[PDB]
Amino acid sequence: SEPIRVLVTGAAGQIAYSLLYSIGNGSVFGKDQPIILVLLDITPMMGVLDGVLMELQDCALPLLKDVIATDKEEIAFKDLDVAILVGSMPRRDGMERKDLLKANVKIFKCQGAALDKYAKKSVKVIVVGNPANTNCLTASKSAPSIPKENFSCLTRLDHNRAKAQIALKLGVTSDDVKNVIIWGNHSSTQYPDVNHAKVKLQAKEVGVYEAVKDDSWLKGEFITTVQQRGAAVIKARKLSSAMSAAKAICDHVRDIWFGTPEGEFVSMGIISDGNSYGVPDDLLYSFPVTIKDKTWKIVEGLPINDFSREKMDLTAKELAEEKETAFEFLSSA
Amino acid sequence: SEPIRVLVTGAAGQIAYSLLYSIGNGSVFGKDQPIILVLLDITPMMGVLDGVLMELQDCALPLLKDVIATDKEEIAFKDLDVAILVGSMPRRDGMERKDLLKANVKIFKCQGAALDKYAKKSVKVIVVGNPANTNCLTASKSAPSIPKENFSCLTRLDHNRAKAQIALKLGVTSDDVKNVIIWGNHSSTQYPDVNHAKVKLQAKEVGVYEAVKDDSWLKGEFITTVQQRGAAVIKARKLSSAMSAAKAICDHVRDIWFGTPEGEFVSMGIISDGNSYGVPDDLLYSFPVTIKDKTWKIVEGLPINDFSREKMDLTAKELAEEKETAFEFLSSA
Ligand SMILES: NC(=O)c1ccc[n+]([C@@H]2O[C@H](COP(=O)([O-])OP(=O)(O)OC[C@H]3O[C@@H](n4cnc5c(N)ncnc54)[C@H](O)[C@@H]3O)[C@@H](O)[C@H]2O)c1
Ligand SMILES: NC(=O)c1ccc[n+]([C@@H]2O[C@H](COP(=O)([O-])OP(=O)(O)OC[C@H]3O[C@@H](n4cnc5c(N)ncnc54)[C@H](O)[C@@H]3O)[C@@H](O)[C@H]2O)c1
Ligand SMILES: O=C(O)C(=O)C(=O)O
């Protein structure tokens, strides 16, 4: 197959350091799919990039057709098929994802403008840098010639985190848990919804509530754990998550590239235009979706209880607030 | 279908951060091999170690059955099926990763002692932390009940780098290169030998001397390039060569676990007793081996030309010296 052009921004940083190996080894786009890898970062990090290039050569990765290290937008965004937007200022212990907004939203406006100008119209754009949803939304709106649908942000890490807490609670495997949902914002108001989740017990596959038999936990400690998870990792490590962040990016892009498995949906921040869940349009909200032929579709018919109604509305409300701040700031100049 | 117990020491830093995902991924011990990862680091790094533990859980790895974090030797080394020894004292620019001997060999003396008392007798121990060969030797000497053959250190990174250099020189792929050999010490006197090595050049296996047609380069710049590679990545990145080291450690441990491909030998530091290559007995030196049923076997009968003889001998002298220096210290008290 002809090579696909995949860009990873902030390529000299931690997340990228934990991710380039998985792209180059074929575990993301396919064991036989060659990659033209494009690596963007700032001028003073170009020497770090060169160290990463020698390490890629020392890792035996033949699927890497070419590896382009650059600090130029013209080169970085040209003809891409995939854009992994990581390049961003990370928060530190004590900060919410919301400060970083003014600092980072400006970067995603220019990058959305760079995609629109230089990348293919078919590009898949994956936004990881914080605030992901708002960053996501801003970049998307500075790329009017690229379908809204090609813009996604990462809630897969929160998804994976929710599964790992279920597996640990029930003493099960991560793969035995399925259909946990991460609704709304990639922030501490995220709703990790296990109402439609399934767990494989030895006698039969049951609902997560039925298998846990602890409603308080599921609506209490379980919610807080997942929500504060990013902040807890930073508090311990003194660095943002990277190993777990990179892996969720691999899972998110693979599910885009290869589709979701029969009877299963995954969490994805996407544009909310047309949803049927009572969520305002024009937001970059995380929904449970099924993917096929690289195209996502929100899962419909999920029964929403009262407890889930509220929670879902609180993340949307929070997302509107971030939308208001970033748009006031980017127009003001 | 039961799990195995693997220890990774120095779990709170660089190399381990790039390596643990590949262990719990199933890419080392097999896609149906469940693992319990045991992470060991010193007391002051327990904060950071808990965040790595959180990241590991957050990757949602079905095979990763349990993850344990401790600063206790009695917990780390209990009932291990595999021990990866990374923890140690660091290196950097200004040369060569020589002086570290006396500041790292105490660590490994202690660590062999714990394996001796707590570890299964069948443990496989891979020594990575520098001085790799001499730390290796010290640990085996302080663990007299665990078979000396069960101990090995890592020359696989130098071996992997060597293949990439040949691939680069010729314009071919790294996996088109077979049977390079890393003779000796993991240091600047190492001997990266290609006399017995093969390359697939234009769909025909030929002989790397035959393919390269530049004997001066193979005996000059290739050798120094492979010996100075680690220092070039570290001066470019300002951080260790973790991504490539993580990959060479997986190579080394997978080949131990599942054996070498038919027709192929790999490089790995082992106990020298009885070799037929003119190298002193009771040394931990790298040789070419074939591996079957988790048991290495030095490849006998390779003709040693004169250039090779002073080089293998030169590496040996250095290793003899490090042996002197390490043991007088440790016995001194
Ligand atoms: N959505 C998620 O789950 C998620 C998870 C983890 C981290 N993140 C976020 O991802 C972002 C990436 O930071 P990190 O964790 O890798 O830490 P990091 O600081 O080590 O890496 C960031 C990299 O971005 C580069 N960079 C900065 N501005 C840039 C620009 N304008 N163009 C290109 N590159 C630029 C930096 O030089 C650096 O190399 C942070 O905002 C972090 O909070 C998001
Ligand atoms: N053989 C090879 O090919 C090779 C290649 C690269 C690096 N290395 C060596 O690997 C080692 C690890 O490097 P790194 O980049 O991860 O360094 P690092 O600083 O990032 O990590 C070392 C870790 O060892 C821990 N440690 C120190 N003493 C310990 C002890 N007694 N018990 C347990 N943990 C202890 C430290 O607290 C730290 O967490 C170094 O010795 C490095 O030179 C070997
Ligand atoms: O730390 C953060 O901001 C994250 O988004 C993360 O680690 O998932």
- Show the beta-strand stretches assigned E in A179-327: 181-183, 191-193, 198-200, 205-207, 266-271, 284-292, 295-298
Residue A168: exposure state from Cβ atoms within 10 A (0-12, 13-18, ≥19): middle
The conformational region for residue B282 under phi > 0 = left, psi -120 to 50 = alpha, else beta, is left
Separation of alpha carbons A12 and A270, rounded Å: 27
The label of the residue with tokens 């990439």 reads B164
Compute CA distances B128 → A100, B163, B165, whole Å. 39, 20, 22
* Closest residue in chain B to residue A225, using alpha carbons only: B54
Compute CA distances B117 → B79, B146, B227, whole Å. 10, 10, 37
- Give the ligand 3 atom nearest the CA of A231: 1
Separation of alpha carbons A314 and B324, rounded Å: 69
Residue A325: exposure state from Cβ atoms within 10 A (0-12, 13-18, ≥19): middle
Q: Residue B184 has what DSSP assignment?
A: B
Give the number of the ligand closest to the Cα of residue B86: 2
Cα angle: B152, vertex B158, B160; to 5 degrees:
100
Cβ atoms of residues A145 and A173 within 8 Å:
no
Distance from CA of A254 to the nearest CA of B (A): 15
Q: CB-side exposure of B302: number of CA atoms within 13 Å?
A: 23
Compute CA distances B143 → B115, B132, B225, B319, whole Å. 7, 17, 36, 20
Cα angle: B93, vertex B99, B103; to 5 degrees:
115
Q: What SS3 class is residue B39?
A: strand
Sequence-separated (6 or more) residues with CB below 8 Å from residue B178: B197, B198, B199, B263, B264
Compute CA distances B25 → A144, A259, B250, whole Å. 39, 21, 11
B278: enclosing H helix or E strand: none
- Which positions in chain B have a beta carbon within 8 angstroms of at least one beta carbon in chain A? 17-18, 20-21, 47-48, 50-52, 54-62, 64, 157, 160-161, 163-164, 168, 173-175, 229, 232-239, 241-244, 246-247
- Which chain B residues contact residue A174 at CB under 8 A? 60-62, 64
DSSP H helical ranges for A5-149: 14-24, 46-58, 73-76, 101-118, 132-141
Cβ atoms of residues B291 and B317 within 8 Å:
no
Separation of alpha carbons B295 and B318, rounded Å: 27
Question: Phi and psi of B210, rounded to 5°?
Answer: -55, -45
Separation of alpha carbons B28 and B6, rounded Å: 11
Q: Residue B160 has what DSSP assignment?
A: H
Residue A72: exposure state from Cβ atoms within 10 A (0-12, 13-18, ≥19): exposed
Which resolution, in Å, applies to this structure?
2.4
Choose among B58, B56, B63: nearest CA to B27.
B63
Residue A2: exposure state from Cβ atoms within 10 A (0-12, 13-18, ≥19): exposed
Interface contact B244-A164, CB threshold 8 A: no
Choose among A204, A209, A198, A203: nearest CA to A176.
A198
- Encoding tokens for residue A126? 């994956």
Compute CA distances B284 → A45, A274, B90, whole Å. 39, 67, 21
Separation of alpha carbons A320 and A324, rounded Å: 6
Using only the alpha carbons of chain B, give its radius of gyration. Answer: 19
Instruction: Tell me which amino acid residue B326 is.
Output: A
Cα angle: B59, vertex B64, B67; to 5 degrees:
90
N-terminal to C-terminal alpha carbon distance within chain A: 45
- Encoding tokens for residue B77? 């080394």
- Tell me the angle at which helices A156-170 and B46-58 cross, rounded to the nearest 10 degrees: 100
Cβ atoms of residues B37 and B67 within 8 Å:
yes
Interface contact B60-A160, CB threshold 8 A: yes
N-terminal to C-terminal alpha carbon distance within chain B: 46
Choose among B194, B245, B196, B200: nearest CA to B223.
B194
B210: enclosing H helix or E strand: helix B208-212
Separation of alpha carbons A36 and A50, rounded Å: 16
Cβ atoms of residues B48 and A237 within 8 Å:
yes
Q: What SS3 class is residue A213?
A: coil
For residue A13, the CA-to-ligand 1 centroid distance in Å is 7
Q: Is A88 in the pocket of ligand 1 (CB under 6 A)?
A: yes
* Closest residue in chain A to residue B237, using alpha carbons only: A48
Question: Phi and psi of A197, rounded to 5°?
Answer: -95, 150
Choose among B58, B72, B235, B250: nearest CA to A237.
B58
Separation of alpha carbons B181 and B202, rounded Å: 23
DSSP H helical ranges for A171-220: 208-212, 215-219
**Residue of B154, B240, B243, B253 to test ligand 2 pocket, by largest number of atoms within 8 Å of CB:** B240
Cβ atoms of residues B194 and B173 within 8 Å:
no
Separation of alpha carbons B258 and A230, rounded Å: 37
Cα angle: A11, vertex A15, A17; to 5 degrees:
60
Q: What SS3 class is residue B153?
A: strand
Cα angle: A83, vertex A84, A85; to 5 degrees:
105
Choose among B290, B268, B272, B291: nearest CA to B281.
B272
Interface contact A236-B48, CB threshold 8 A: yes
- Give the ligand 1 atom nearest the CA of A241: 6
Choose the mutation target among B25, B59, B200 for the interface with A, i.e. most A CBs under 10 Å.
B59
Interface contact A236-B54, CB threshold 8 A: yes
- Give the ligand 2 atom nearest the CA of B154: 1
Choose among A161, A140, A160: nearest CA to A152.
A140
For each of the domains in chain B, give its residue range(s) and CATH number, in order of start: 1-153 (3.40.50.720), 154-333 (3.90.110.10)
Sequence-separated (6 or more) residues with CB below 8 Å from residue B328: none
* Atom 11, ligand 1: residue with shortest CA distance: A129
Asked if residue B156 belongs to a known ligand binding site, the reply is no
The conformational region for residue B261 under phi > 0 = left, psi -120 to 50 = alpha, else beta, is beta
**Residue of A15, A101, A233 to test ligand 1 pocket, by largest number of atoms within 8 Å of CB:** A15
Choose among B284, B245, B283, B279: nearest CA to B268.
B284
Separation of alpha carbons B10 and B199, rounded Å: 37
Q: What SS3 class is residue B325?
A: helix
The label of the residue with tokens 């030895």 reads A202
Asked if residue A227 belongs to a known ligand binding site, the reply is no
Question: Phi and psi of B287, rounded to 5°?
Answer: -135, 160
Separation of alpha carbons B82 and A153, rounded Å: 39
B241: enclosing H helix or E strand: none
The label of the residue with tokens 């885009």 reads A256
Tell me which method was used to determine the 3D structure: X-ray
Q: How many of the other CB atoms lie within 10 Å of CB of A329?
A: 14
> Which residues make beta-bridge pairs with B146?
none
Compute CA distances A251 → A23, A64, A113, A157, whole Å. 11, 20, 27, 9
Choose among B85, B6, B28, B82: nearest CA to B255.
B28
